[PDB]
Protein backbone atom coordinates (compact mmCIF):
# COMPACT_ATOMS: atom_id res chain seq x y z
CA UNK A 1 0.00 0.00 0.00
CA UNK A 2 3.07 2.37 -0.01
CA UNK A 3 3.24 5.08 -2.75
CA UNK A 4 5.84 3.05 -4.62
CA UNK A 5 3.54 0.01 -4.65
CA UNK A 6 0.91 2.31 -6.37
CA UNK A 7 3.30 3.42 -9.15
CA UNK A 8 2.15 2.09 -12.49
CA UNK A 9 -1.22 1.00 -11.25
CA UNK A 10 -3.04 2.45 -14.37
CA UNK A 11 -3.42 1.03 -17.88
CA UNK A 12 -5.48 2.18 -20.83
CA UNK A 13 -5.82 2.24 -24.56
CA UNK A 14 -5.43 5.71 -26.16
CA UNK A 15 -8.81 7.68 -26.46
CA UNK A 16 -10.44 5.05 -24.19
CA UNK A 17 -9.60 6.17 -20.69
CA UNK A 18 -7.24 4.98 -18.00
CA UNK A 19 -8.28 2.26 -15.54
CA UNK A 20 -7.22 0.84 -12.22
CA UNK A 21 -7.76 -2.69 -10.90
CA UNK A 22 -10.39 -2.97 -8.13
CA UNK A 23 -12.24 -5.65 -6.30
CA UNK A 24 -15.96 -5.55 -5.37
CA UNK A 25 -17.90 -7.91 -3.07
CA UNK A 26 -17.10 -10.76 -0.71
CA UNK A 27 -15.41 -12.90 -1.86
CA UNK A 28 -13.63 -10.31 -4.08
CA UNK A 29 -14.56 -9.97 -7.72
CA UNK A 30 -11.78 -8.37 -9.83
CA UNK A 31 -12.74 -5.62 -12.28
CA UNK A 32 -10.92 -2.90 -14.17
CA UNK A 33 -12.38 0.50 -13.41
CA UNK A 34 -12.00 3.69 -15.44
CA UNK A 35 -10.63 6.60 -13.35
CA UNK A 36 -12.92 9.61 -13.94
CA UNK A 37 -12.38 13.03 -12.35
CA UNK A 38 -15.38 14.22 -14.42
CA UNK A 39 -18.15 12.32 -12.53
CA UNK A 40 -19.01 11.13 -9.04
CA UNK A 41 -20.79 7.73 -9.40
CA UNK A 42 -18.99 4.44 -8.85
CA UNK A 43 -20.68 2.02 -11.25
CA UNK A 44 -19.81 -1.42 -12.62
CA UNK A 45 -21.22 -3.62 -15.46
CA UNK A 46 -23.52 -6.06 -13.60
CA UNK A 47 -25.00 -8.00 -16.54
CA UNK A 48 -23.63 -9.41 -19.74
CA UNK A 49 -22.77 -7.02 -22.61
CA UNK A 50 -20.99 -7.64 -25.94
CA UNK A 51 -18.08 -5.44 -24.92
CA UNK A 52 -17.64 -6.64 -21.26
CA UNK A 53 -15.08 -9.37 -20.51
CA UNK A 54 -16.60 -9.78 -17.09
CA UNK A 55 -19.17 -8.18 -14.77
CA UNK A 56 -20.24 -7.82 -11.15
CA UNK A 57 -22.42 -10.78 -9.94
CA UNK A 58 -24.21 -9.43 -6.89
CA UNK A 59 -25.74 -12.86 -6.09
CA UNK A 60 -22.19 -14.18 -5.31
CA UNK A 61 -21.47 -11.43 -2.80
CA UNK A 62 -22.66 -11.92 0.84
CA UNK A 63 -21.78 -8.31 1.69
CA UNK A 64 -23.87 -6.81 -1.11
CA UNK A 65 -26.73 -4.72 0.29
CA UNK A 66 -29.52 -3.60 -2.10
CA UNK A 67 -30.60 0.07 -1.68
CA UNK A 68 -33.90 -0.47 -3.58
CA UNK A 69 -33.38 2.53 -5.80
CA UNK A 70 -32.65 2.94 -9.53
CA UNK A 71 -30.17 5.39 -10.96
CA UNK A 72 -29.41 6.71 -14.52
CA UNK A 73 -26.34 8.67 -15.55
CA UNK A 74 -26.16 10.43 -18.95
CA UNK A 75 -22.57 11.33 -19.68
CA UNK A 76 -21.46 13.71 -22.47
CA UNK A 77 -20.83 10.53 -24.45
CA UNK A 78 -22.66 7.32 -23.45
CA UNK A 79 -25.24 6.64 -20.69
CA UNK A 80 -26.24 3.79 -18.39
CA UNK A 81 -28.95 2.77 -15.97
CA UNK A 82 -28.86 0.40 -13.04
CA UNK A 83 -29.66 -0.35 -9.46
CA UNK A 84 -28.02 1.13 -6.32
CA UNK A 85 -26.60 -0.90 -3.46
CA UNK A 86 -23.43 -0.94 -1.28
CA UNK A 87 -20.64 -3.50 -1.02
CA UNK A 88 -17.04 -3.82 0.07
CA UNK A 89 -14.47 -2.45 -2.32
CA UNK A 90 -10.62 -2.61 -2.44
CA UNK A 91 -7.85 -1.39 -4.78
CA UNK A 92 -5.19 -4.17 -4.92
CA UNK A 93 -2.48 -1.68 -6.07
CA UNK A 94 -3.92 1.26 -4.06
CA UNK A 95 -3.91 1.81 -0.31
CA UNK A 96 -4.12 -1.21 1.87
CA UNK A 97 -7.75 -0.83 3.00
CA UNK A 98 -11.28 -2.15 2.25
CA UNK A 99 -14.25 0.16 2.39
CA UNK A 100 -17.97 -0.10 2.06
CA UNK A 101 -19.11 2.13 -0.75
CA UNK A 102 -22.15 2.88 -2.86
CA UNK A 103 -22.12 0.98 -6.19
CA UNK A 104 -24.43 1.38 -9.16
CA UNK A 105 -24.95 -2.08 -10.74
CA UNK A 106 -25.32 -1.26 -14.47
CA UNK A 107 -27.97 -3.35 -16.13
CA UNK A 108 -28.57 -1.35 -19.38
CA UNK A 109 -26.26 1.05 -21.21
CA UNK A 110 -25.83 2.81 -24.60
CA UNK A 111 -22.56 3.86 -26.16
CA UNK A 112 -20.83 3.69 -22.76
CA UNK A 113 -18.81 0.48 -22.81
CA UNK A 114 -16.10 0.51 -25.51
CA UNK A 115 -15.17 -2.60 -27.59
CA UNK A 116 -11.58 -3.74 -26.45
CA UNK A 117 -11.10 -1.09 -23.75
CA UNK A 118 -10.41 -3.62 -20.96
CA UNK A 119 -12.49 -1.81 -18.35
CA UNK A 120 -15.84 -2.85 -16.87
CA UNK A 121 -16.88 0.06 -14.60
CA UNK A 122 -16.19 3.65 -13.66
CA UNK A 123 -14.82 5.40 -10.59
CA UNK A 124 -16.23 8.91 -10.41
CA UNK A 125 -13.71 10.88 -8.25
CA UNK A 126 -15.50 14.27 -8.27
CA UNK A 127 -17.84 15.61 -5.53
CA UNK A 128 -21.30 14.60 -4.33
CA UNK A 129 -22.87 17.75 -5.85
CA UNK A 130 -22.84 16.05 -9.27
CA UNK A 131 -23.66 12.45 -8.15
CA UNK A 132 -26.89 10.87 -9.52
CA UNK A 133 -29.64 10.53 -8.46
CA UNK A 134 -28.66 13.42 -6.17
CA UNK A 135 -26.00 14.66 -3.73
CA UNK A 136 -26.97 12.38 -0.92
CA UNK A 137 -25.31 9.45 -2.72
CA UNK A 138 -21.81 9.59 -1.09
CA UNK A 139 -19.04 9.17 -3.67
CA UNK A 140 -16.36 6.50 -3.36
CA UNK A 141 -13.50 8.82 -2.40
CA UNK A 142 -15.60 10.43 0.40
CA UNK A 143 -16.33 6.97 1.79
CA UNK A 144 -12.63 5.99 1.57
CA UNK A 145 -11.54 9.10 3.49
CA UNK A 146 -14.26 8.77 6.12
CA UNK A 147 -13.73 5.12 6.71
CA UNK A 148 -9.90 5.00 6.79
CA UNK A 149 -6.99 7.26 7.72
CA UNK A 150 -6.19 7.96 3.98
CA UNK A 151 -5.38 11.65 3.62
CA UNK A 152 -7.93 13.56 1.51
CA UNK A 153 -5.88 13.87 -1.68
CA UNK A 154 -5.04 11.80 -4.74
CA UNK A 155 -2.78 12.45 -7.71
CA UNK A 156 -2.83 11.27 -11.32
CA UNK A 157 0.11 10.73 -13.62
CA UNK A 158 -1.42 9.80 -17.01
CA UNK A 159 1.26 8.68 -19.49
CA UNK A 160 0.67 8.83 -23.24
CA UNK A 161 3.08 5.86 -23.55
CA UNK A 162 1.64 0.49 -28.93
CA UNK A 163 -2.06 1.42 -28.37
CA UNK A 164 -1.48 0.62 -24.65
CA UNK A 165 -0.84 3.48 -22.19
CA UNK A 166 -0.01 3.49 -18.47
CA UNK A 167 0.30 5.75 -15.46
CA UNK A 168 -0.16 6.06 -11.77
CA UNK A 169 -2.95 6.98 -9.36
CA UNK A 170 -1.44 7.82 -5.97
CA UNK A 171 -4.10 7.65 -3.28
CA UNK A 172 -3.55 9.75 -0.22
CA UNK A 173 -0.47 11.63 -1.26
CA UNK A 174 2.18 12.93 -3.61
CA UNK A 175 5.04 10.75 -4.92
CA UNK A 176 8.01 13.04 -5.72
CA UNK A 177 9.46 10.40 -8.12
CA UNK A 178 6.58 11.14 -10.56
CA UNK A 179 7.49 14.73 -11.37
CA UNK A 180 10.32 17.26 -11.74
CA UNK A 181 10.47 20.96 -10.98
CA UNK A 182 7.83 22.76 -8.89
CA UNK A 183 4.13 21.94 -8.30
CA UNK A 184 1.96 25.03 -9.06
CA UNK A 185 -1.55 25.13 -7.57
CA UNK A 186 -4.74 26.54 -8.89
CA UNK A 187 -7.81 26.85 -6.57
CA UNK A 188 -10.82 24.57 -6.90
CA UNK A 189 -13.50 27.22 -7.47
CA UNK A 190 -16.40 25.01 -6.35
CA UNK A 191 -16.51 21.42 -5.14
CA UNK A 192 -18.81 19.78 -7.76
CA UNK A 193 -16.79 19.05 -10.87
CA UNK A 194 -13.11 19.84 -10.29
CA UNK A 195 -13.78 23.40 -11.41
CA UNK A 196 -10.85 25.77 -12.10
CA UNK A 197 -10.37 29.19 -13.81
CA UNK A 198 -8.28 29.85 -16.92
CA UNK A 199 -7.10 33.49 -17.04
CA UNK A 200 -5.28 33.56 -20.40
CA UNK A 201 -4.72 31.38 -23.49
CA UNK A 202 -1.76 31.80 -25.88
CA UNK A 203 -0.93 29.94 -29.09
CA UNK A 204 2.79 30.14 -29.80
CA UNK A 205 2.91 32.93 -27.26
CA UNK A 206 0.23 35.04 -28.98
CA UNK A 207 -2.59 35.95 -26.61
CA UNK A 208 -6.04 35.06 -27.98
CA UNK A 209 -7.10 38.48 -26.57
CA UNK A 210 -10.56 37.71 -25.27
CA UNK A 211 -12.30 38.76 -22.07
CA UNK A 212 -11.05 36.01 -19.72
CA UNK A 213 -14.59 35.10 -18.61
CA UNK A 214 -15.01 33.63 -22.15
CA UNK A 215 -12.39 30.97 -21.25
CA UNK A 216 -14.60 29.76 -18.37
CA UNK A 217 -17.97 30.04 -20.06
CA UNK A 218 -19.79 28.59 -18.27
CA UNK A 219 -17.25 26.56 -16.21
CA UNK A 220 -13.74 25.13 -16.71
CA UNK A 221 -12.98 21.64 -15.37
CA UNK A 222 -10.24 18.94 -15.12
CA UNK A 223 -11.65 15.73 -16.43
CA UNK A 224 -9.67 12.48 -16.82
CA UNK A 225 -12.79 10.85 -18.36
CA UNK A 226 -12.92 13.06 -21.46
CA UNK A 227 -10.19 12.56 -24.02
CA UNK A 228 -9.91 15.99 -25.75
CA UNK A 229 -9.28 19.54 -24.66
CA UNK A 230 -12.77 21.00 -25.17
CA UNK A 231 -13.17 24.78 -25.52
CA UNK A 232 -16.30 27.07 -25.43
CA UNK A 233 -17.24 27.83 -29.10
CA UNK A 234 -15.81 31.36 -29.19
CA UNK A 235 -12.46 30.22 -27.67
CA UNK A 236 -12.43 27.08 -29.91
CA UNK A 237 -12.87 29.20 -33.12
CA UNK A 238 -10.07 31.67 -32.06
CA UNK A 239 -7.74 28.77 -31.16
CA UNK A 240 -8.34 26.91 -34.45
CA UNK A 241 -7.74 30.13 -36.45
CA UNK A 242 -4.43 30.67 -34.67
CA UNK A 243 -3.26 27.04 -34.98
CA UNK A 244 -4.19 27.03 -38.71
CA UNK A 245 -2.17 30.21 -39.17
CA UNK A 246 0.88 28.79 -37.35
CA UNK A 247 0.69 25.54 -39.37
CA UNK A 248 -0.25 27.07 -42.73
CA UNK A 249 2.78 25.65 -44.57
CA UNK A 250 0.46 22.60 -44.81
CA UNK A 251 -3.32 22.66 -45.41
CA UNK A 252 -5.62 20.06 -43.90
CA UNK A 253 -9.27 19.27 -44.62
CA UNK A 254 -12.09 20.87 -42.56
CA UNK A 255 -12.95 17.41 -41.16
CA UNK A 256 -9.50 17.27 -39.49
CA UNK A 257 -10.14 20.58 -37.61
CA UNK A 258 -13.64 19.24 -36.63
CA UNK A 259 -11.74 16.47 -34.85
CA UNK A 260 -13.50 13.83 -36.96
CA UNK A 261 -10.97 12.95 -39.73
CA UNK A 262 -7.39 11.63 -39.53
CA UNK A 263 -4.31 13.32 -40.83
CA UNK A 264 -1.48 10.90 -41.88
CA UNK A 265 2.21 11.25 -42.65
CA UNK A 266 4.62 8.63 -43.83
CA UNK A 267 5.82 6.84 -40.57
CA UNK A 268 8.46 8.76 -38.56
CA UNK A 269 7.92 12.05 -40.53
CA UNK A 270 5.19 13.85 -38.58
CA UNK A 271 6.13 17.59 -38.94
CA UNK A 272 5.85 18.52 -35.20
CA UNK A 273 7.61 21.81 -35.75
CA UNK A 274 4.91 23.32 -37.93
CA UNK A 275 2.35 23.11 -35.08
CA UNK A 276 2.42 25.64 -32.25
CA UNK A 277 2.53 25.24 -28.50
CA UNK A 278 -0.66 26.07 -26.60
CA UNK A 279 -0.33 27.79 -23.21
CA UNK A 280 -3.16 27.67 -20.69
CA UNK A 281 -2.71 30.15 -17.83
CA UNK A 282 -4.47 28.96 -14.61
CA UNK A 283 -5.53 31.25 -11.79
CA UNK A 284 -2.97 31.11 -8.99
CA UNK A 285 -3.43 31.01 -5.20
CA UNK A 286 -2.61 34.74 -4.86
CA UNK A 287 -4.59 37.63 -6.33
CA UNK A 288 -3.91 38.30 -10.07
CA UNK A 289 -1.02 35.79 -10.15
CA UNK A 290 -1.17 32.80 -12.49
CA UNK A 291 1.05 30.03 -13.85
CA UNK A 292 0.95 28.35 -17.22
CA UNK A 293 0.87 24.87 -18.50
CA UNK A 294 2.26 24.43 -21.99
CA UNK A 295 0.82 21.72 -24.34
CA UNK A 296 2.94 20.54 -27.41
CA UNK A 297 1.40 19.15 -30.60
CA UNK A 298 2.49 15.67 -29.39
CA UNK A 299 -0.26 16.07 -26.79
CA UNK A 300 -3.06 17.68 -28.92
CA UNK A 301 -2.52 15.57 -32.06
CA UNK A 302 -3.70 12.14 -30.71
CA UNK A 303 -2.24 9.13 -32.55
CA UNK A 304 -4.81 6.63 -33.77
CA UNK A 305 -3.23 3.16 -33.73
CA UNK A 306 -4.49 0.98 -36.55
CA UNK A 307 -2.48 -1.78 -38.18
CA UNK A 308 -4.26 -1.08 -41.46
CA UNK A 309 -2.86 2.48 -41.63
CA UNK A 310 0.58 1.61 -40.11
CA UNK A 311 2.70 2.54 -43.24
CA UNK A 312 1.80 6.01 -41.78
CA UNK A 313 1.44 7.73 -38.45
CA UNK A 314 -2.09 9.08 -38.25
CA UNK A 315 -3.61 11.49 -35.77
CA UNK A 316 -6.86 13.09 -34.74
CA UNK A 317 -6.98 16.73 -33.74
CA UNK A 318 -7.76 16.35 -29.99
CA UNK A 319 -9.30 19.80 -29.46
CA UNK A 320 -13.16 20.10 -29.78
CA UNK A 321 -15.82 22.72 -29.49
CA UNK A 322 -17.93 22.56 -26.27
CA UNK A 323 -21.24 24.05 -25.31
CA UNK A 324 -20.75 23.24 -21.54
CA UNK A 325 -17.47 25.09 -20.81
CA UNK A 326 -13.78 24.16 -21.04
CA UNK A 327 -12.83 20.53 -20.40
CA UNK A 328 -9.16 19.90 -19.68
CA UNK A 329 -9.27 16.25 -20.70
CA UNK A 330 -6.76 13.51 -20.73
CA UNK A 331 -4.73 14.88 -23.64
CA UNK A 332 -4.05 17.96 -21.39
CA UNK A 333 -3.34 15.90 -18.24
CA UNK A 334 -0.94 13.54 -20.09
CA UNK A 335 2.68 14.32 -19.19
CA UNK A 336 1.75 16.43 -16.12
CA UNK A 337 1.49 15.16 -12.62
CA UNK A 338 -1.87 16.43 -11.39
CA UNK A 339 -2.59 16.59 -7.68
CA UNK A 340 -6.19 16.71 -6.62
CA UNK A 341 -5.61 18.33 -3.25
CA UNK A 342 -9.15 18.08 -1.89
CA UNK A 343 -7.99 18.83 1.71
CA UNK A 344 -6.77 22.29 0.58
CA UNK A 345 -9.34 22.77 -2.21
CA UNK A 346 -6.69 23.21 -4.94
CA UNK A 347 -5.22 21.30 -7.89
CA UNK A 348 -1.46 21.08 -8.38
CA UNK A 349 0.29 20.69 -11.73
CA UNK A 350 3.89 19.70 -12.34
CA UNK A 351 5.90 18.38 -15.29
CA UNK A 352 5.64 14.59 -15.14
CA UNK A 353 8.46 12.05 -15.23
CA UNK A 354 6.68 10.90 -18.44
CA UNK A 355 6.61 14.40 -20.04
CA UNK A 356 6.36 15.31 -23.65
CA UNK A 357 9.62 16.66 -25.17
CA UNK A 358 11.37 16.52 -28.51
CA UNK A 359 14.83 17.98 -29.27
CA UNK A 360 13.42 21.48 -29.54
CA UNK A 361 10.48 22.07 -27.09
CA UNK A 362 9.37 20.67 -23.76
CA UNK A 363 5.93 20.74 -22.02
CA UNK A 364 6.24 23.05 -18.96
CA UNK A 365 4.50 24.23 -15.80
CA UNK A 366 5.82 27.64 -14.88
CA UNK A 367 5.17 30.97 -13.22
CA UNK A 368 4.41 33.28 -11.66
CA UNK A 369 2.73 35.64 -14.12
CA UNK A 370 0.97 38.83 -13.03
CA UNK A 371 -1.87 40.63 -14.69
CA UNK A 372 -2.72 44.32 -14.28
CA UNK A 373 -6.45 44.04 -15.16
CA UNK A 374 -8.51 43.49 -12.02
CA UNK A 375 -11.30 41.51 -13.74
CA UNK A 376 -12.53 38.28 -12.12
CA UNK A 377 -12.25 35.57 -14.75
CA UNK A 378 -14.96 33.36 -13.22
CA UNK A 379 -18.12 33.25 -15.28
CA UNK A 380 -20.82 31.70 -13.06
Ligand SMILES: Cc1cc2cc(c1)C(=O)N[C@H]([C@H](O)CNC(C)(C)c1ncc(C(C)(C)C)o1)COC/C=C/CCCC2=O
Pocket residue numbers: 015016017034036038039040073074075076077078122130193221223225226227327
Ligand atom coordinates in the same frame (compact mmCIF):
# COMPACT_ATOMS: atom_id res chain seq x y z
C1 LIG B 1 -16.64 13.84 -25.71
C2 LIG B 1 -16.46 12.63 -24.85
C3 LIG B 1 -15.65 11.59 -25.25
C4 LIG B 1 -15.45 10.44 -24.47
C5 LIG B 1 -16.08 10.35 -23.21
C6 LIG B 1 -16.86 11.43 -22.80
C7 LIG B 1 -17.09 12.56 -23.58
C8 LIG B 1 -17.51 11.38 -21.46
O1 LIG B 1 -18.66 11.73 -21.39
N1 LIG B 1 -16.74 10.99 -20.42
C9 LIG B 1 -17.27 10.71 -19.08
C10 LIG B 1 -17.01 11.86 -18.11
O2 LIG B 1 -17.68 11.58 -16.84
C11 LIG B 1 -17.67 13.12 -18.67
N2 LIG B 1 -17.48 14.28 -17.77
C12 LIG B 1 -18.28 15.49 -18.01
C13 LIG B 1 -17.97 16.02 -19.42
C14 LIG B 1 -17.97 16.49 -16.88
C15 LIG B 1 -19.73 15.07 -17.81
N3 LIG B 1 -20.73 14.93 -18.71
C16 LIG B 1 -21.83 14.50 -18.01
C17 LIG B 1 -21.45 14.44 -16.68
C18 LIG B 1 -22.29 13.98 -15.46
C19 LIG B 1 -21.69 12.64 -15.00
C20 LIG B 1 -22.11 15.01 -14.32
C21 LIG B 1 -23.83 13.75 -15.63
O3 LIG B 1 -20.11 14.76 -16.54
C22 LIG B 1 -16.67 9.37 -18.62
O4 LIG B 1 -17.04 8.32 -19.56
C23 LIG B 1 -16.15 7.17 -19.53
C24 LIG B 1 -14.86 7.50 -20.29
C25 LIG B 1 -14.51 6.90 -21.42
C26 LIG B 1 -13.21 7.29 -22.12
C27 LIG B 1 -13.35 8.52 -23.01
C28 LIG B 1 -14.19 8.08 -24.21
C29 LIG B 1 -14.59 9.29 -25.02
O5 LIG B 1 -14.26 9.27 -26.20
